Amino acid sequence: RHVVICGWSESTLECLRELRGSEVFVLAEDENVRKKVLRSGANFVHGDPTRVSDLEKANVRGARAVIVNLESDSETIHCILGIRKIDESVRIIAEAERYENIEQLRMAGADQVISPFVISGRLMSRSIDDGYEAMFVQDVLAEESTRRMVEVPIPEGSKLEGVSVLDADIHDVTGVIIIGVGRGDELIIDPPRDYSFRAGDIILGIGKPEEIERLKNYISA
Amino acid sequence: RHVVICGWSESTLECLRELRGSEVFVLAEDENVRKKVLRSGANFVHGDPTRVSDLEKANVRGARAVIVNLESDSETIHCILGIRKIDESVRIIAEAERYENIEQLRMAGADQVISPFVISGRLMSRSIDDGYEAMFVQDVLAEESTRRMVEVPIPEGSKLEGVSVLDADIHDVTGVIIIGVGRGDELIIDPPRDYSFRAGDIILGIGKPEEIERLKNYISA
Ligand SMILES: [Ca+2]
Ligand SMILES: [Ca+2]
Ligand SMILES: [Ca+2]
Numbered sequence: 132r133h134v135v136i137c138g139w140s141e142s143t144l145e146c147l148r149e150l151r152g153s154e155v156f157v158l159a160e161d162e163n164v165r166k167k168v169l170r171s172g173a174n175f176v177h178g179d180p181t182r183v184s185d186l187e188k189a190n191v192r193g194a195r196a197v198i199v200n201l202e203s204d205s206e207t208i209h210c211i212l213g214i215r216k217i218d219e220s221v222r223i224i225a226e227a228e229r230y231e232n233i234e235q236l237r238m239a240g241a242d243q244v245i246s247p248f249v250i251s252g253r254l255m256s257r258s259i260d261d262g263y264e265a266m267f268v269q270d271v272l273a274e275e276s277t278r279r280m281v282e283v284p285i286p287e288g289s290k291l292e293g294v295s296v297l298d299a300d301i302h303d304v305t306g307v308i309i310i311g312v313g314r315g316d317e318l319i320i321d322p323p324r325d326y327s328f329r330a331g332d333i334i335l336g337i338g339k340p341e342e343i344e345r346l347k348n349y350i351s352a
Numbered sequence: 353r354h355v356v357i358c359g360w361s362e363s364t365l366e367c368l369r370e371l372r373g374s375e376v377f378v379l380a381e382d383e384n385v386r387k388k389v390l391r392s393g394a395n396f397v398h399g400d401p402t403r404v405s406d407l408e409k410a411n412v413r414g415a416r417a418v419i420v421n422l423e424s425d426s427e428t429i430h431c432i433l434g435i436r437k438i439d440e441s442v443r444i445i446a447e448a449e450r451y452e453n454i455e456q457l458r459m460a461g462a463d464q465v466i467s468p469f470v471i472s473g474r475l476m477s478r479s480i481d482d483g484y485e486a487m488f489v490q491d492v493l494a495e496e497s498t499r500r501m502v503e504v505p506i507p508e509g510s511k512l513e514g515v516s517v518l519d520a521d522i523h524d525v526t527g528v529i530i531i532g533v534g535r536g537d538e539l540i541i542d543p544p545r546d547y548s549f550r551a552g553d554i555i556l557g558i559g560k561p562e563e564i565e566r567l568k569n570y571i572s573a
């Protein structure tokens with residue numbers, strides 16, 4: 132049930148803001164941060180995240196996900212290897228500073244790598260003329276937009292099981308845009324007319340909260 | 353024609369990678385970086401980006417855009433104020449470290465603020481279960497995906513001028529997903545069935561390169 136966050140960066144403050152309610156352990160060796168963690172409804176564990184014994188202490192085993200952002204990619208990797216000695220199946224989401232290190236984070240055991248500076252650099256080069264790309268990305272991720280991005284799973288025995296993307300006319304029917312469909316660790320963005328849904332597929336969509344509802348019901352049983 | 357980049361961060365390396373060819377002046381006071389800039393086909397100007405006279409030196413006046421990322425938000429703001437004393441109309445894109453400072457960057461003169469750590473923190477909290485949101489955002493911004501995000505303007509005398517979003521059936525017709533339409537500094541994400549296009553509107557879409565073409569032609573008078 133619980134999520135362990137290893138290290139502290141400006142990212143994890145924004146991260147805890149969205150996990151409020153959910154049970155979170157933050158494991159860091161910077162006491163100055165304990166005050167901030169507690170304020171977020173989270174729990175603080177003073178410790179060295181590159182040390183296996185201190186990961187045990189944050190109870191990494193059986194946690195549903197471990198988020199990892201240390202001060203440098205080199206230490207981020209040291210933490211991951213540490214986590215993998217403990218629990219080799221647990222989901223690890225790591226933050227990468229330099230592009231060059233993305234492959235090594237993945238290699239040490241990261242299931243998903245997020246690169247704020249790559250994202251950020253690409254957005255800045257695309258914002259020279261019109262800043263729409265930047266506006267879109269920063270807006271759909273905000274808890275305050277009329278439009279939001281969601282993942283809706285297609286359940287076993289779904290009305291849509293077997294139906295093609297073209298035949299389902301989901302946009303016309305529910306108001307939701309399908310931006311992609313994903314299954315396991317693969318994502319198909321803007322799927323082709325002839326893609327056939329299967330129970331287990333995750334629909335990645337954008338829509339008003341009511342449109343999302345019309346979609347959830349349009350699927351089921 | 354030229355773009356001035358003020359300061360150096362991990363972001364601006366990724367930024368220059370995408371502006372290769374385009375003429376770029378980087379103004380920073382860290383000589384260690386000169387080697388890196390030159391390698392990117394960019395030009396280096398040693399100087400203090402909070403100093404008006406050194407902005408003049410990077411020729412900020414008449415540049416098409418100034419990207420600003422200094423070591424702290426406090427200094428980023430100092431730079432923007434400096435720019436605005438020189439040229440009060442030029443486009444400024446700034447990177448913000450802390451969320452609290454986004455309003456102050458905007459206030460000092462920034463036309464667009466990008467917040468890699470906010471983006472990154474939100475993505476990490478959404479990647480706990482399925483990392484699709486993260487995969488989508490990092491993939492459409494990559495120059496190597498079959499699917500890419502583009503801004504296609506609707507030209508004066510366009511076939512679509514006056515047509516509603518619903519009547520234009522752009523997805524069915526061109527294979528491109530409309531994720532939003534923008535005009536000036538406003539962006540409407542996932543526009544409603546009854547929105548009417550006007551010359552000048554920018555369509556923000558996702559699609560295969562050929563679909564983008566069928567779209568561009570589908571518009572033009
Ligand atoms: Ca753009
Ligand atoms: Ca809609
Ligand atoms: Ca998710």
Ligand SMILES: [Ca+2]
Nearest residue numbers: 321322527528
């Ligand atoms: Ca398509």
